[PDB]
């Protein structure tokens, strides 16, 4: 399971600015914090994890101070870099920690400037990853001067993140291990080339994310199956469709087999 706090900050000009954050634990949303809201909102009942009411307020207040502090720090940094860098500016942040068995963790804090990954917090300081421009050496020098924030970020990544996620995984064990049965349906679309036809196998409403969808001639599996990308549903379930370019006549005597954890042993087979 990978826990991540995704922040998206937009600075249109010297005055206008907004920062919105979304927090995830695997493929499930746990928190949301829009620029309009003065407090971090829970999207799951177990979003507070194993933290006490007093422990959460202390944590939320740190973020509340950070959000205001961050907005000004970027505004001043743009002043410090002018005319080299100017608005519109879009700064993204991806901070969290991936959990491993046997009390093992690996924490990250990645910063992206205008869609490109440029800065990261590593060890005891801010650092520019390879590929990043050299002008960022001055903002990093200034950001590394502030020892107070460095000690806070160090504590947050090394201790606060793994301890919170451990409890979060304990509290949300039921929702993460939840099983949803997939409903499959067949359809056909005539392809661009004269002769062949694309046969689609629409699979929807399955959870967890790993699934097996393939086109079968009966018992022999077809190598020409093209499984698409995972598309999300509103009710936190998944959608996936697998295509197969079959010639007009090969359509009959073909089925779609779907194997998922929720189904158990009996796989969903739909004959054309």
């Amino acid at each position, epitope marked *: 399971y990978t826990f991540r706090c995704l922040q998206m900050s937009s600075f249109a000009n010297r005055s206008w600015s907004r920062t919105d954050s979304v927090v995830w634990l695997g493929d499930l949303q746990t928190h949301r914090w829009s620029n309009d809201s003065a407090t971090i909102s829970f999207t799951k009942p177990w979003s507070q994890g194993k933290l006490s009411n007093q422990q959460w307020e202390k944590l939320q207040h740190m973020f509340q*101070v950070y959000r*205001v*502090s961050f907005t*000004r*720090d970027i505004q*001043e*940094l743009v*002043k*410090m870099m*002018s005319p080299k860098e100017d608005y519109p500016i879009e700064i993204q942040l991806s901070a969290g920690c991936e959990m491993y068995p046997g009390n093992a963790s690996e924490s990250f804090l990645h910063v992206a400037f205008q869609g490109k990954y440029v800065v990261r917090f590593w060890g005891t300081s801010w650092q520019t990853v390879p590929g990043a421009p050299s002008w960022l050496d001055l903002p990093i*020098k*200034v*950001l*590394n*001067a*502030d*020892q*107070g*924030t460095s000690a806070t970020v160090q504590m947050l990544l090394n201790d606060t993140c793994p301890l919170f996620v451990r409890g979060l995984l304990e509290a949300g064990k039921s929702d993460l291990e939840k099983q949803e049965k997939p409903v499959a349906w067949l359809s056909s679309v005539p392809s661009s080339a004269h002769g062949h036809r694309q046969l689609v196998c629409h699979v929807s409403g399955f959870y967890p994310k790993p699934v097996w969808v393939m086109w079968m001639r009966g018992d022999q599996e077809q190598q020409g199956t093209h499984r698409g990308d995972f598309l999300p549903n509103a009710d936190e379930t998944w959608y996936l469709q697998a295509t197969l370019d079959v010639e007009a006549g090969e359509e009959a005597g073909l089925a779609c087999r779907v194997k998922h954890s929720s189904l158990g042993g009996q796989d969903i087979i739909l004959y054309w």
Partner: T-cell receptor, first 111, second 113 residues
Framework: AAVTQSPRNKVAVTGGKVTLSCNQT?????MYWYRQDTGHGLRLIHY???????EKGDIPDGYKASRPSQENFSLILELATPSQTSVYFC??????????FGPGTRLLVLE | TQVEQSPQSLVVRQGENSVLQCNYS??????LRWFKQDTGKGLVSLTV?????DKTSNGRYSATLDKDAKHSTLHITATLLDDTATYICVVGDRGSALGRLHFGAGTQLIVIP
């Protein structure tokens, strides 16, 4: 880390042009202009993050800043008003929070 | 308005100790500086407090900082005639150059020789 201010005292007339200069040989990128008045603390007028840069402070109205080089930062009063009778302080600093202050400049604007 | 010092002014006799207060509503509170300013002269830094619960000393000057209470005190043990000056409290909202300095009006000390 020493910061010098010229002049140390100035007597100007209303409508006249006043220029308060500040020199720093500490190779500091950032420089700040403040004014001290009885009943108030030091209030930021203008500040510069480097040569060419000039940024508005908390009370900029009536004052124009100029950073021609890393060494010098000037506070220009295009049209002097008697309300600009104050003790003006200059400061400089690197990436750190410490601002190294100048000795001060007393300015009097007479009618 | 964000940084306030008490008392506004005070008169002490030579050898007596003087205690000066500072209360601030500044957010965030990185460091606190105590300045000594002689009549007409410039700003001389006395001490800097940086921790959540800090206690610093420099000769006769000693200061304490309580970041949770957002309060600071300056004790001048056995005041001398040359201690007659204005004492200014300063709060910095960042640990880097990005910070703004929030100054107090000052406490005027008069020492009777």
């Amino acid at each position: 880390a020493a910061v010098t201010q010229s002049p140390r005292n100035k007597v100007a007339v209303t409508g006249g042009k006043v220029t308060l200069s500040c020199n720093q040989t500490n190779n500091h990128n950032n420089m700040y202009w403040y004014r001290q008045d009885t009943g108030h603390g030091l209030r930021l007028i203008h500040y510069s993050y480097g040569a060419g840069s000039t940024e508005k402070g908390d009370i900029p109205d009536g004052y124009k800043a100029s950073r021609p080089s890393q060494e010098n930062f000037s506070l220009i009063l295009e049209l002097a008003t008697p309300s600009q009778t104050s003790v003006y302080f200059c400061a400089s600093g690197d990436e750190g929070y410490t601002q190294y202050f100048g000795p001060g400049t007393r300015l009097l604007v007479l009618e | 308005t964000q940084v306030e010092q008490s008392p506004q002014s005070l008169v002490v006799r030579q050898g007596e100790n003087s205690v000066l207060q500072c209360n601030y509503s500044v957010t965030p509170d990185n460091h606190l500086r105590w300045f000594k300013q002689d009549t007409g002269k410039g700003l001389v830094s006395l001490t800097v407090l940086v921790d959540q619960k800090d206690k610093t000393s420099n000769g006769r000057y000693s200061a304490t900082l309580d970041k949770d209470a957002k309060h600071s005190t300056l004790h001048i043990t056995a005041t001398l005639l040359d201690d007659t000056a204005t004492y200014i409290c300063v709060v910095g909202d960042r640990g880097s150059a990005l910070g703004r300095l929030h100054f107090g009006a000052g406490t005027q000390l008069i020492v009777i020789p």
